[PDB]
Curated annotation (Swiss-Prot):
Keywords associated with the record: Antimicrobial, Disulfide bond, Fungicide, Plant defense, Pyrrolidone carboxylic acid
SMART domains assigned: Knot1
Domain of life: Eukaryota
Subunit structure: Forms oligomers in its native state.
Protein's UniProt name: Defensin-like protein 1
Entry annotated with the keyword Transit peptide: no
Keyword Disulfide bond applies: yes
GO biological process: defense response to fungus; killing of cells of another organism
Lineage of the organism: Eukaryota, Viridiplantae, Streptophyta, Embryophyta, Tracheophyta
Family matches, as InterPro entries: Defensin_plant, Scorpion_toxin-like, Scorpion_toxin-like_sf
Family (UniProt): Belongs to the DEFL family.
Length: 51
């Protein structure tokens, strides 16, 4: 709901892989979903924390 779409607390960078980005994010930190979202410049491991 009130999620903040931070580049993952850990993986604060380029992703090239949605599944991993998601997994790694919520596996290491405790965010809800994550995904290898686009937007300029390149894809990055965006993750949704209940901020």
């Amino acid at each position: 709901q009130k999620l903040c779409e931070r580049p993952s607390g850990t993986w604060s960078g380029v992703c090239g892989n949605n599944n991993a980005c998601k997994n790694q994010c919520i596996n290491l930190e405790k965010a809800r979903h994550g995904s290898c979202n686009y937007v300029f410049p390149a894809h990055k491991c965006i993750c949704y924390f209940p901020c």
